[PDB]
Structure formats: C-alpha cells, structure tokens
Curated annotation (Swiss-Prot), chains A, B:
GO terms for molecular function: active borate transmembrane transporter activity; solute:inorganic anion antiporter activity. Residues 53-71, 138-151, 213-229, 303-329, 411-466 are extracellular. Efflux-type boron (B) transporter for xylem loading, responsive of boron translocation from roots to shoots under boron limitation. Boron is essential for maintaining the integrity of plants cell walls. Belongs to the anion exchanger (TC 2.A.31.3) family. Keywords: Anion exchange, Cell membrane, Endosome, Ion transport, Membrane, Transmembrane, Transmembrane helix, Transport, Vacuole. It comes from Arabidopsis thaliana. This is Boron transporter 1.
Amino acid sequence: FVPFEGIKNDLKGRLMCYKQDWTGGFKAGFRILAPTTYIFFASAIPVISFGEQLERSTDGVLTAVQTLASTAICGMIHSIIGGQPLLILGVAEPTVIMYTFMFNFAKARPELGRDLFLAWSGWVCVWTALMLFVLAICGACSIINRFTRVAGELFGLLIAMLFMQQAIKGLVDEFRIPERENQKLKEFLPSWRFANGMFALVLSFGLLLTGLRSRKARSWRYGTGWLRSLIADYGVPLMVLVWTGVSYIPAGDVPKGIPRRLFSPNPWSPGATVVKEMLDVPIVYIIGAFIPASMIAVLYYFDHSVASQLAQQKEFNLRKPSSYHYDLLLLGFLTLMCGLLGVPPSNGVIPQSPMHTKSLATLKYPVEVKEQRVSNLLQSTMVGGCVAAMPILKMIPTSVLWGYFAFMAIESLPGNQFWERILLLFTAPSRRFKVLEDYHATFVETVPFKTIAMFTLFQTTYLLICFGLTWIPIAGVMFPLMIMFLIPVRQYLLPRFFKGAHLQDLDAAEYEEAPALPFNLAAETEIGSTTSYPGDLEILDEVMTRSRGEFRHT
Amino acid sequence: FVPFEGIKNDLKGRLMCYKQDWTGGFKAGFRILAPTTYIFFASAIPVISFGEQLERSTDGVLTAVQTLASTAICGMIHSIIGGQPLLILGVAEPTVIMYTFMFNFAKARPELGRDLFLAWSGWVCVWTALMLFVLAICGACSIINRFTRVAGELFGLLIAMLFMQQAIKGLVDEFRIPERENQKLKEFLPSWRFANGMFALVLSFGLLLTGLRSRKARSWRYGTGWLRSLIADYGVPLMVLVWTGVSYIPAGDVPKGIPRRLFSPNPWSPGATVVKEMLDVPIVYIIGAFIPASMIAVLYYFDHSVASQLAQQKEFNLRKPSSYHYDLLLLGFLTLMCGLLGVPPSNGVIPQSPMHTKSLATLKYPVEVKEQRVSNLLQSTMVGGCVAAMPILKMIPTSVLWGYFAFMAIESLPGNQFWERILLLFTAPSRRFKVLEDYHATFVETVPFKTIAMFTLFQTTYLLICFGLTWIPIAGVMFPLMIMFLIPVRQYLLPRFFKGAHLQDLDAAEYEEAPALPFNLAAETEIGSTTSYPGDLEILDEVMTRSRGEFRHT
C-alpha cells in the first residue's frame, strides 16, 4: 500500500501502448463502426431513461440533456487520457437514486431549496473527488479481489428491483395528471387520461416482450445470418422505433399529448457552471456534504472496479495491462468536473463494458480482442450528438422508456446465481430432478440443499432489508454502506456458520456450470433422490397433440 | 353398401352394453365429476363465443342463448340414445359461417327478410336431415377411411384463419360504435371509445398469453401436483375469471359500458318453434334451401365422423364397438329438431371428444378408458344450466372472447403437419439441421425437401383459394365442396405427380414422429447437408451471461 505506486505502475504500463492504441483503431478502417454503433445504442437509451427519471424526480432541474452531456464528455476524456479504453462510462441508476435523495433533502430545507441543489451537489462531488483521490493514492484498489459474488449479485438484484419499481411508478403516473402541467388541457380529462394509461400499458408491454424475444435472434433457424445478427444487436432501438411509429398511428384522431412523450426540454429553444452559486451554500451544508459523498465514493469504487474487471476477463486474452488505480484517479477528476458543470457524474457501467469487449472480439480457429481508443471516442461523441437530436428523441413515448426499465430489470436475472438459488429455494422437493435435467450450477450437485437454503435465506433477508432502507426518506442514502459491509461479513462471519468448500462453491469468483444429466443419473443424487413418477394426464399431455388429440408415435 | 346394414349392426352392438354403460357411470361415484367439469368448461366457452359472433353477424336473431340450448339438448339426447357417448356435440364455427352466409342472403331479399330467416334455416335443416338420412342408410360412412390428413389439416388451418379473422374483427369493432346501440351515450364518445379499444387490447392479449402459458402447467417444477393439474385443466376459465375481475377494477371511475360486455340478452327478462312461419316461406326458396343444405351435410358428414374417429383411437384400447351410421342418422334427426326449434344445429367437435376420452383414461402400470353415458349427460345439462346463469355470463367482456378466438387459432397449430411443413418451407437452407435437433416428423428424413416443398405449395395454394372463396358474398357458401374435392384429388391426381411412399409418408393416417438427432448425425443427412458454422458473436452469446457478461465454464 505504498502511496502513488499503483498509479505510477499503471501509467508506465499504459504509456507504452498509446500510439499503438490509436493506430490499431485507425487500421481497422470502417469496420470499427459496427461495434461503435452497437455500444452507442447500448449506452444511449438507458441514459435517456435515467434522464427522464431524474426529470420526474428533480422537478426538471436535471433531464436527459445533462445525463447525455455527462456521459459523452466523460467517455471522450476517458477514451483520450484514460487507462483502460475498453471501460464504458455513463450515468447509472445508483447515482440517480443518490441525487434523488439529495434533491428531496434540499427541497425541504429553506436554506438550500431547489435553487442551491446543484451547488450543494457540486460540493458533494468535490468531496467525492477528494475521497476517490485518497483511495487511488493509497492503493485501495489492490483489495478489489474481495469484491466477491455475494455482494455483486445482491447489488444487481437490488438495482433490478429498483428498475421494476420505476417502471410501475411511471405506468401508474400515465393514468394521472403530471405535477407541472396545465390541468385544463383536453388531454388531461379523465377519459383521455384513462385512454393514455391503457395505451401506455400496450406500448410498454409490446416493447418489453418484443425486445426480450429479439435478444435470442442469433439462435433462430430463420432468415439470413446478417439479418439475425442485426436483430440480436439492435432489437432494442429497432423496437423503440417500431413502437414509436405505432404510437403515431392515431395521432390524427387524438389530442396532442396522447400518448405522453418525453418531458425533457429541447436545448435549442431560447427558453433552455455552478461555481457562482457554490459560494452561496452555507458552510454547515458544505461540510455536511461529506455524508452523501462518502456513499457515492463507495458506490463508484465498487462499480468502476467491477466493470473494469468484467471487461478484462482473462478469457479475452488481453495483451495490455490494467490501470485500476489511475482509472479511479481519473474518475475522481471527472466527478469534480461534472460537479462543477452541474451534471451528474458518470462511472463504469455493466454490462456495457464486457459487451463492448465482446463486440471487439473475434475467434481464430481462441478469443482475440481488438483493443483501441477509437470505438469509445466515437460512441461517446455520438452520445453527445444525441443532445443536438433532442427534437427527434422527444418523439419517443414515456411508456416505451418504462417498458425499457422493466426490460433491464428482467435482463439482470439470467446469469445471476442468487436469482437461480431463490428459484431453487421456492422449488418443490419432488421436482428438483427437473433442475438437474438442464444446464445448472455445480453447487447444486456439490452442496447440500440445506446449506444452499440457509445461504439464500440470509442473502434474501439482506437484500430485502436494503430495499426497505431505500424507502426511508433520509437514512435510505446509506445503502452503499450496507453493500460494502458484505465484504467483511463474507470474510469473517460466514466461515463461522458455513464450512469452507461450501462457501467457495457458493461464492466462487468464476461462473461454474454443469451440463444436463440423464434421468437415471438425476435420481441417484441426494437432491434428486425424491423423484415422483409422472401422473396419467401428465404422461398423456406429451403423447397426444393439442390441436386434434392425435397420439404421437415415436 | 347394403341399405340399413350398418345402422342395424351398430344398434345390435350398442344395445348389448347400454345398462352397463349406465351402471359403470354410477359406479364411478363422485369421481366422475372432474372429467365432467373439465369437458363442460372445454365445451361452454367456445359455444358462448360463437353465440356472440352470431349475435354480431345476425343482428341479434341468434345469440349465446340459442347456441347453449342447442348444445345442451343435442348432447343430452346423444348421451341417452346415442351410439358413441364419448363423442361431444356442440355448435361449431363452420355452422356459424354457413348461417352468416344464409342471413346475408336472406336480408338482401325482400321476400325473405330478417323475419323469415329462421324459417328458411329450418327448411335448410330439413333438407340437411334428409341428406344425412340418405347418407346413413346408404352406408356412406363405410368410406371415411378416405378422409385423409391432407383434407383434415387444411380444414383445421382454414378454421384457425377464420378464428384469427374474427378476433381481429372484434378488436377493431371495440374502437367503433355498435350498429344497434344508442349513439348518444357517454360511453360512445371518441375519448371513451379509444379508451375502450385500448382496454380491450390489454384484456385480450392478457387472456391469450396467460392461457397459452397455463396450457403447459403439468411440466412445471413448481407447486403441488394437484395445483399443477388444476391449472393445466382449468386455466382458460380461470384466466377468463381473472381478466373479468381486472376489467372490473376501474368500474367506479368509468361509464357503464367501459369495457364493453356481452351483447347476448338475458332470457329471464320479460323482453326476451318456427313451424308457423315455415309455411309462409315461398316455395321457390323452400326448394332453393337444397343448396346450402348440401354443403352443411358435407360439413357434418366430415366433422362428425372425424371427431368420432379421433375419440375412438385404437390406443385408448376401447372394448365397445362403433356406431358411425346410427350416429349420423341421429345427427340428422337432431338437425331436424334444431331447425324446427329455431337454433343452429350441433355436431361432433374437436378436440373436445378426444380430450373427453383422455380425461376418462387411466394407465395400469396400458391405457384404460372409463366409457359411460353419465359424464356427457351431466356436462350437457350443465351447458344447459348456463342459460339460466346468463346474468353472470354477461359480466364477461367481449375482448376476452376475442382473445379466446385468437387462443383457439393458435392452439390449432401445434400438432398440425401442414403448419410444420409451412415453417420448414420458409426455413433457411443452412438452418435445417436445427429442425433435426428436436422432435420432428419422419418425412423430414425419409422425403426429399423438393417433394415436401411442392406438396406444401399445392396445399397452401388450395388453402388460400378456399379462404378467398369464403370472402365472396354468395359463392363463399361452397367451401365445403372444395374441402370434399380433396378426397378424389388425393386418391387419383396426386399419385400421377407424386411417387407412392412419398405420398404415404406425407399423408399418413398415423402421426409418425422422430427423436432428436446428434449434431454429427444431423449433418450426414441430405436435408442437413448444408450446415454452416456458427459466427463469433453467435458463439459468444452462449458462453457469456446476459446479466453481467460473465464467461460460463463447463
């Protein structure tokens, strides 16, 4: 933990591959645009959704303009002078939640109010930048190996819960009058409001289901290869466009605001740095900003490092070194800059970074990744240009964004072992052989079900407590402390209750899977030792057709 | 083809097992109620949907009351004095289409009009009864072995197309003012109409998707066995109830008719035999009724026999004989009775009859079927009692019935080989190995793809021509003739163009399936000889998690 050692080593390592980092990007030619566009679409849409969320949560102080600007500027700076260009930066949901807490605190205090919210947030960002500088200089990133699966998966499920909560919140508001809108408009009559709510339900569920189906296009037996890849890569934006077009079908027979569209304003309209108002904040609140700043620094020190680790998985066979410490230092500087500019800070986001690395990967029949600084710079510049295209983006209905929130919530589940363990916990004892008939984790076979159940119950209790804490008006801004407390807990307390190899299998740093087992081998196991025979109607359901009741012959 | 031989033989066979047919039903005790209730729900809901369809198509002359009454009375008579009690009778979609054609013909002719439509239909039913008597006496049912798969599957797909068309028709009308309603009501304002249409979309799609998911409950690893069986058996009625309840959520904040509910009237209200008006029909039209009567007799002679055959599949190991000829004779008598009473005739329906037989089946570890006349009688009496419960049924929204129409359309597909062949025809040449990696028909391996393609193209052209003919105002009532022409076509013309075993495999009376093949064996085949290797992103999609981009280790 020698000060400045990690930063110096990272800088020495990354300074030998800068010119190559650029030339290899230019040598790829126009073929570098496909990963660029893919990651640009993967980054922009969630950022716009978070911007709308903030617009609703901050009474219009922060909108999609600010989130897009922060994402673009931070991404460009990271691409040019950052250590690991594979890392993708952007505004994330936890930052939105923290800023919502801060806004709610400031609004109820006359000394700050809505007019000094951004100044107080700038002071918070100054504190966060200092904390991140200290963490990077002291080499705190040398212990990121202790950021085990138990904390990451719990945080992911918490963020998925919050995504779904936001989706439900928005869909319920689609039936209500907005707070800052003229209540006398025809679009806000009870009939038109009910119609708008129903149309929002239709559009949101359509987007969600169609995108979820599109995600598995490359496995279809239909169409061309390029068409299947196009669907699998750009389904989300394609479905957003399709459902916007659908929303425009009744445009001629309904009022202007049916369905409701994005509330974020257009920056080009004449109606439209916070350092000047920063001096006006009372000293007591300048000092008190230390409190949320510590939580934000915790969140960033976790998320940045985890995203970089995921983007630098050893299976990619990357040949260039890592820059964790210098990356955290630059993140502190970027947070200071964003606080001074009046925009929310950005940080490493998941799964955008590993998806970018994958988009830059090819197999030599064996993974080889094309690492360079051009794709990140171009995608960040496109995210920035999206600000100028705000008139076009304002045509998107809000229900589509709520559907996208639900989409992210559901997409956080697939590879999450905590979710699989919850499903197993709620599974019937006589139907676990079914669990054993498909791809499954190894701890299902190597760990007794009682220990899995106890571990999952502890994890679920922790998750529910954190979710409930998020609902407390003021104390809810402490949930990153609860997230970090899982490190010492896993390191010290769990070994007392759990026995070694069981913990290692249940909290493995590597995703270990197992292939499907034959039915005969799925019963000799302890977990599948309570196999019950199928019923008569269960058997007949499979040997007779549903269309005409015809017996199938095999 | 000796006259009265088949009827006499069937009567002699079925007269030796009547008392046992009843006693075995009474000996089953209260356990006979589960199949009874299952088949009652399987029969009632489509009949109510057809009743609403007729109400919209006949300007209120025929409604769900008449369809329910016909189904109940015919089922009871068949249960008591019928030959094969496993056969389930009811009003079917083709009868609805024929009656719609007849109503449209009568309305445009001042000599008949809406006031003599039922009388003309009674004369049509008299002609149909005479035709069926002739067919049964002459032993025309001795050649039902020529009702091959090519005709049955084409007819099924045509009826599925018509189901989906009715669903779309109803959902579009949910946005419009009904023809015979007061246009000044608040519920028919543009805003409330748009809201009603959107709510109808929501409810219909919810019903459809939830029912389709419920159909596969017995294969779940969750819940109890009895709960899974309950879901798999009663999902459709359960989801109808659930979505009706959902429809009642905004009842306090919306006008009376939001959402629209069943239009069929309640027979108990004071506002509410056609032999008297039958004498008033002109002689020319009495004679002309011969034309639609022949088509209806074709439809019934096909459907009754096919449904009985499906209910009497040899795999059920039934120990009692068949009564095809006497069943057709009784169907003629029932059609005469229904025409005299002013209700549409009923006939054998699919897949209700084989599903009833399956519900009466148990495996002795080997199928053993409990054949008796109690379940059919009880379910028919319950269908009849549903008439008295019309006030409760009128609470169902029409959008739920349109969703059920779409549900039947989609449920007609699974075991249909014509649909599978269409999908194969539109499949990519390089992705047929995927077809070979799952359960598939044998002709995929035993027949070249060119012959399958030609056969499927001919069948699809025939189907589309029949569907288009259904759209012609008057000539569309001839489509049963097109259906029957497939018998001589298959028997005489196809062998000229197709070569023996290929036709036998493509038009086998038995549903022949084949198990999944290994990838190595799926390429040596001629059809799977154009296997293309997966792409880099296709490979990476499977080895990395979608939630966090984590490499999977196997």
